[PDB]
Amino acid sequence: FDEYEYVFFDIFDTILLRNVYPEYTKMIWSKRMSVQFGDKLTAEEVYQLRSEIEARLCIENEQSGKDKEFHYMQLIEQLYRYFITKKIISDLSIQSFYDICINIETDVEIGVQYVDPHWLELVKHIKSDSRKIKVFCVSDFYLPKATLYSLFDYHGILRYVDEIYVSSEILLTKKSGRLFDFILELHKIAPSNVLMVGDNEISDYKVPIEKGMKAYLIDRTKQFNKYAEHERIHKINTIVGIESQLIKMANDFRKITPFHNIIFSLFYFIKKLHETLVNRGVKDVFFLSREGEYLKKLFDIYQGQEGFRNIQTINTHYLLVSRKATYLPSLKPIESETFNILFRQYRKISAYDFLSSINFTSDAMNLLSTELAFDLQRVEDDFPTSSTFQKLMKSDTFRNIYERERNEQNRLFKKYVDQFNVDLTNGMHIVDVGWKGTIQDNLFNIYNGEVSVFGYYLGIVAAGEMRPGNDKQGILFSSIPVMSSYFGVFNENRAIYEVLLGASHGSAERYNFNESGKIIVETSKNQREFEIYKNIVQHTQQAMEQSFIELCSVLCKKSIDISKYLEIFAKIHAEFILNPNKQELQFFDKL
Ligand SMILES: [Cl-]
Numbered sequence: 001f002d003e004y005e006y007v008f009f010d011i012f013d014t015i016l017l018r019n020v021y022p023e024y025t026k027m028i029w030s031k032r033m034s035v036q037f038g039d040k041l042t043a044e045e046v047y048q049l050r051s052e053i054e055a056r057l058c059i060e061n062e063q064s065g066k067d068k069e070f071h072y073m074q075l076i077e078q079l080y081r082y083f084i085t086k087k088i089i090s091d092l093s094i095q096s097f098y099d100i101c102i103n104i105e106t107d108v109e110i111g112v113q114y115v116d117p118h119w120l121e122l123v124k125h126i127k128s129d130s131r132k133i134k135v136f137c138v139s140d141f142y143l144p145k146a147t148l149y150s151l152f153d154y155h156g157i158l159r160y161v162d163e164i165y166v167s168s169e170i171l172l173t174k175k176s177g178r179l180f181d182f183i184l185e186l187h188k189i190a191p192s193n194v195l196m197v198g199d200n201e202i203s204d205y206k207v208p209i210e211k212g213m214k215a216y217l218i219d220r221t222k223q224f225n226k227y228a229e230h231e232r233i234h235k236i237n238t239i240v241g242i243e244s245q246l247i248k249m250a251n252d253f254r255k256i257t258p259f260h261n262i263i264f265s266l267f268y269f270i271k272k273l274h275e276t277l278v279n280r281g282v283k284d285v286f287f288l289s290r291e292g293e294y295l296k297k298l299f300d301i302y303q304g305q306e307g308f309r310n311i312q313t314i315n316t317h318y319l320l321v322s323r324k325a326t327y328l329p330s331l332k333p334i335e336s337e338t339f340n341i342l343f344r345q346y347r348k349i350s351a352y353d354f355l356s357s358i359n360f361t362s363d364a365m366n367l368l369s370t371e372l373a374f375d376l377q378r379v380e381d382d383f384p385t386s387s388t389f390q391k392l393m394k395s396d397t398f399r400n401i402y403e404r405e406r407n408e409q410n411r412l413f414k415k416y417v418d419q420f421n422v423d424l425t426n427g428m429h430i431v432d433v434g435w436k437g438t439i440q441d442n443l444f445n446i447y448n449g450e451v452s453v454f455g456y457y458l459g460i461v462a463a464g465e466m467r468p469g470n471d472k473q474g475i476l477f478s479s480i481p482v483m484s485s486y487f488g489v490f491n492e493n494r495a496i497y498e499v500l501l502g503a504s505h506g507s508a509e510r511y512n513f514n515e516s517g518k519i520i521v522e523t524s525k526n527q528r529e530f531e532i533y534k535n536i537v538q539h540t541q542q543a544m545e546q547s548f549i550e551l552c553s554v555l556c557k558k559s560i561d562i563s564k565y566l567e568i569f570a571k572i573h574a575e576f577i578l579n580p581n582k583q584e585l586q587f588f589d590k591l
């Protein structure tokens with residue numbers, strides 16, 4: 001050994017290593033900023049704008065008596081110029097625009113960074129035994145010192161470091177050597193009492209040796225080869241071999257569970273849905289029972305696999321709703337209600353069917369049938385023109401129970417929603433499989449049009465009562481206004497989505513309070529639907545969760561627009577709908 005008072009460590013590719021090549025973090029930040037601001041600019045246009053500004057400040061700071069370097073606030077101030085002149089931002093000051101910027105990049109770095117385990121035992125040795133050595137960090141970088149304080153604290157290594165010196169705070173670099181002149185002068189260090197340790201031969205050895213310090217150059221040929229082949233594959237707008245990679249990933253999953261490969265469609269839905277919610281500025285989203293239980297499960301996972309930590313993170317809830325629970329409170333007063341939504345698909349029904357669809361109780365059913373001398377069980381060929389329907393509409397007992405239970409369920413459901421701590425002032429944002437968005441039409445009526453409702457569906461084949469304030473969206477496929485690209489692929493045999501997206505509980509029936517006044521949603525326990533999930537759907541739901549993670553490690557933390565490869569997902573989907581092999585068909589009939 002010699003005898004050093006200070007050990008100076010380079011940061012990047014010395015202490016912190018990246019899963020991606022270092023330039024890819026500005027591309028990922030570019031894609032996430034393009035989603036952040038309304039897709040006004042593409043992921044590549046914001047990235048080109050960052051390049052043009054970064055190399056601009058380098059040349060400008062160079063010939064201002066400073067060194068070739070830029071502070072992060074200088075980049076953000078210029079970005080605020082282009083954004084506000086091109087009308088990309090609105091109601092956004094410079095300070096809040098900086099917050100979104102620095103939080104995307106801080107989460108981006110956190111997602112791909114990892115500390116060198118060799119550096120950990122090393123810095124532990126330095127910070128232990130007995131003789132007291134101080135540990136500094138000198139890095140040529142653009143992020144503020146407070147940002148690298150955050151990263152080191154998050155990695156749990158800031159306890160071994162005593163100072164952090166970044167070229168962005170004083171705009172002096174290790175390359176020019178002036179940053180060394182500043183640290184040695186301020187701290188009053190004798191050069192020969194410093195051991196510099198880094199990966200660059202110029203900035204971490206040649207210049208330190210010239211300044212009088214002892215230096216050690218560690219080898220990174222194995223780490224920079226990993227960056228070399230990763231840059232071969234991941235560019236700003238493409239990933240080479242992504243088609244064969246997905247298709248190969250789709251050949252080995254097929255025997256896991258029957259119809260295991262719709263998980264690729266669900267990943268496209270989850271990834272494009274998230275872009276749409278963040279683009280719309282959505283902070284709260286509701287997943288509808290019961291098909292939405294597994295959809296929320298995958299959406300909560302996805303945000304965790306993308307590294308969303310402090311920005312572009314969405315709170316998700318679970319709204320216990322069913323067609324039956326949401327239709328009654330949405331109706332008009334009996335003087336105007338025609339029940340057309342119920343009569344457009346069901347006509348050959350019984351009074352028991354009708355009184356259950358408008359969600360009457362068995363006591364009301366056992367009183368109306370008993371009072372009006374009709375059979376509750378008897379099914380009619382045309383109920384809207386039936387005698388029993390004409391009897392009910394005229395009966396005052398019906399007319400009493402109708403107004404009482406329509407206004408109560410409306411009051412009880414609305415206070416059930418208030419328990420979720422969501423401000424419907426900006427809008428109620430809902431996600432489901434759908435096809436039609438029936439429940440959404442009910443929800444919008446329940447609030448009497450005072451609440452803007454936004455629907456986001458896996459697929460949409462029927463518009464229903466779409467109108468201003470009642471908006472619907474088909475993420476994977478839609479027929480509004482026109483059929484979207486590859487409509488026939490995902491619409492064909494679309495029943496498998498309802499099968500594989502079963503929930504663990506019963507269907508939502510009605511709303512009432514518990515003991516204290518808090519609203520409890522009663523569910524109908526259908527024993528055979530419970531057995532289907534427990535013994536079949538639940539197992540395949542968790543087997544697809546694992547293949548969903550592997551799709552995440554290949555498609556999360558990238559700069560790609562997922563919509564550019566919908567054809568690849570349409571390809572994979574068709575290979576088991578246009579040719580579903582052997583027993584997969586018999587599994588479909590069982591449930
Ligand atoms: Cl450096």
Ligand SMILES: [Mg+2]
Nearest residue numbers: 010011012013
């Ligand atoms: Mg370095």
Ligand SMILES: [Mg+2]
Nearest residue numbers: 111112113114
């Ligand atoms: Mg990692």
